[PDB]
A paper describes a structure:
T4aP undergo cycles of extension, adhesion to a surface, and retraction that generate a force sufficient to pull a cell forward. The T4aP filament is composed of thousands of copies of the major pilin.
The subunits in the filament are related to each other by an azimuthal rotation of 100.7° and an axial rise per subunit of 10.0 Å, generating a right-handed 1-start helix with a pitch of ~36 Å and 3.6 subunits per turn, as determined from the power spectrum of the filaments. The filaments are ~7 nm in diameter and, in contrast to all previous T4aP structures, resemble a rather solid cylinder without the corrugation of the surface observed in other T4aP structures. The N-terminal α1-helix of PilAMx extends from residues 3 to 54 and contains the hydrophobic α1-N (aa 3 to 18) and the amphipathic α1-C (aa 24 to 54) separated by an unfolded stretch of five residues around the conserved Pro22. The large globular domain (aa 55 to 208) contains two antiparallel β-sheets, one four-stranded sheet composed of β1-4 and one three-stranded sheet composed of β1′-3′, as well as three α-helices (α2-4). Two disulfide bridges are present in the large globular domain. C183/C203 connects the β’-sheet to the C-terminal part of the globular domain, somewhat similar to the C-terminal D-region known from other major T4a pilins that attaches the β-sheet to the C-terminal portion of the globular domain. Within the T4aPMx the globular domain of an individual PilA monomer extensively interacts with neighboring subunits, including six different subunit–subunit interfaces, three large (N:N-3, N:N-4, N:N-1) and three small (N:N-7, N:N-2, N:N-6).
Numbering used by the authors:
A (entry chain L), C (entry chain M), E (entry chain N): 1 to 208
B (entry chain O): 157 to 208
D (entry chain J): 53 to 208
F (entry chain G): 53 to 104
Write the structure that this text describes.
Amino acid sequence: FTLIELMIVVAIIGILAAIAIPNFIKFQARSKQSEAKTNLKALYTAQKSFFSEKDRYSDFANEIGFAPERGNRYGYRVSAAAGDCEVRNAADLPVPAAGVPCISNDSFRFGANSAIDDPTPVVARFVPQGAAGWNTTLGVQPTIADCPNCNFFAGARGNADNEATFDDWVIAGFEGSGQVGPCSEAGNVASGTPYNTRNDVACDGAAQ
Amino acid sequence: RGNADNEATFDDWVIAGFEGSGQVGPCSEAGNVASGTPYNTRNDVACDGAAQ
Amino acid sequence: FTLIELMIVVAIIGILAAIAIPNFIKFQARSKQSEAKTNLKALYTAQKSFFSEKDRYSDFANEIGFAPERGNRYGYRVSAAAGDCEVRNAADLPVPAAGVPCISNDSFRFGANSAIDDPTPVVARFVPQGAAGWNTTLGVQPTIADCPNCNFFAGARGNADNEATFDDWVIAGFEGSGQVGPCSEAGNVASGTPYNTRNDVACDGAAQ
Amino acid sequence: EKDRYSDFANEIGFAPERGNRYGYRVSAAAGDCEVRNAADLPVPAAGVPCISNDSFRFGANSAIDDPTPVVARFVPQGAAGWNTTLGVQPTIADCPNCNFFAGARGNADNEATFDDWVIAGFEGSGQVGPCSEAGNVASGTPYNTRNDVACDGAAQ
Amino acid sequence: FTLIELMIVVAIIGILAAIAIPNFIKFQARSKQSEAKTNLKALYTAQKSFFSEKDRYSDFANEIGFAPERGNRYGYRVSAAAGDCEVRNAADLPVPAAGVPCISNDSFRFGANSAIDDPTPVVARFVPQGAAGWNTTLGVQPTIADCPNCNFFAGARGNADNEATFDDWVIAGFEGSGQVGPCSEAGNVASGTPYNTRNDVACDGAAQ
Amino acid sequence: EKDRYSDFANEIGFAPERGNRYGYRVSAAAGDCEVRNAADLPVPAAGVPCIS
């Protein structure tokens, strides 16, 4: 071999140093998104058990008996009722003053700037189906005043990897269908199946 | 009066032969209670501490 | 190093890009097959409760009190009696005209081409055991005319991953034994244990 | 997870890092190709079935805004009768979807013309030609329909 | 990158292929052990009902009315009285010649080499408490001759996963305490609570 | 990469620079020898086993 071959060898190792391999942060974000699914299905289960025992759905996480373990990355909202969001910013959880409809993000181990004290998801791209005319307002609907309550509606809000913006999930007791968009999938969603209104792995910005 | 799992504090139940209504709180539910139905005044699953 | 080493590095990456890993679609199909087990055991339980209260088994899912949740992937048949199979092709379930002996696949969220409106399984490789001489016909046997009814027989039919063909399950109130075959296991089956007559993970085609 | 294949890269969860040199198409559905012509990626308006070449660091004249490869020399094998149209086939209407089909398009060194790749979920066989290899291709193995290292010009 | 990196990648996948993950057969054995708990509590309930109606405890499973469903994995002994153990080695259960004090393992669907025709558990590590001076001999004690019978004592015996040796349980009508050992837990046992004398998940061999 | 040797110079990826003085044959298979008789190299009709 000659000088040109050897310089080409050097240039090839330089090329491999700057190779453009797949973005695996997307894969790791998809890995992290499973907290939302598991915890929302736990919320569904607890709501069903509470209704069975009490003939009514609940607007608060205290009565349902649902709480995710620390390190959650996601803030969970059980209803739009008034109250604080159980801020998790210390080793010891605070003593509640009243029923809590929302559970904040665990900012103890993720930093103070990562806090989510109002974990209300986006529901623009979830369309309820059926003749019962259900809405997209979170919580027990049409009102908690009807003991044979129509199906509840809940959701979560979080951040996957270093996305400045959030990803949103919803779970409903009724059938609905998703809409196609820059940050969501199209297809019918069975009752009790989490749906990703904004996934944050596809998009980052004003996209919804 | 008892204790569920590793709660330092207790949960409380009552049963009455007369009608009553529960009050909303950090550790209790709101709604009317028929005579002969146990009511959980403090449930210990929702809260642990000074909460009642 | 020299040119040959560097081209060998490139070729090794080409090799790893085309490596032959295990087929994990089979593992996921085995994951999806658990609906059939859970729902068939629920069918068994509901049939036993119905007999206990009424001194007789039923050929209809209305009377038993059994219905899987939406998104089931499997059609269930409680009997061979006449009647429509509660087609699940819309958000609102249809109002029945009479007792339904079969529950169709949930084609609302799986597409219209995936519909299973006649979920009758294959029972060739299930051999009832015992002197009572039980048959493999689905439903209450020998007839619902005998209130101390001999044990029932029921099954399910579905599709796991992208198999064009189906996998079939059965559950019986009486003992039986499985036969070895291209798509089934050999061994004795206790009463109340689902048996996979055709699994659809081992095979796809005319194999039974 | 979903019992169906996708025609959009945003739902799949796939995106190559910057400096890719290759444009990728996951389907022939309608939509823009996520033009990578600036430091900050654009906000999509809808689902994107194609990812353009990263012309930010390779120049504006090197842009590939429609990375549809050549598929003349890939022959699907099997009785299922699969096609060479890119995307989910025969159509996304069948949730037990038949295998997808995808590809890429790029330029190696100073070739004026491009080189093309395909990856399928089904079996196929390559055809001998001026710019391709002959032999059977297993499912999930990339195949080089036009390699651009052997040829440059009208050759396919 | 260079050759060393690529060979290190190959070596790392080789490492992962031989990773030492937790032994999950122990978790599955713990899952399988629930038959013993449920069926022993059923024995306890049936014995209590029989006493209430008849003012005496029974030494036979026929009179009590207790029989586990097929596929039991465990043999149950209600007394040490003489008699056969209702061998479950065929689809049709045998017609009993006389009262049966024991129920054999269901070897119909577990194989002939897994038969347990004498399911007498180990009782070395169960110490009765109280001034009444109760014993560890299985059955109605001190004798069935006293109608205000002192509390009964029963147990089960089985095999979890591929342990060559067996695991043993006991349920008593009187208070007792466990003894710490290689295959048992230490702590007080309330009357009517099954206790695992040898668990077979912790140990396999001569350990008791 | 492919678990087989090639009969053609197209697939291997081998071509000497212009001014080579030597003709190279990688196989005896049928095909033309990539005649280098002009400034622009010809477009091949099929795999070439030899380089003129």
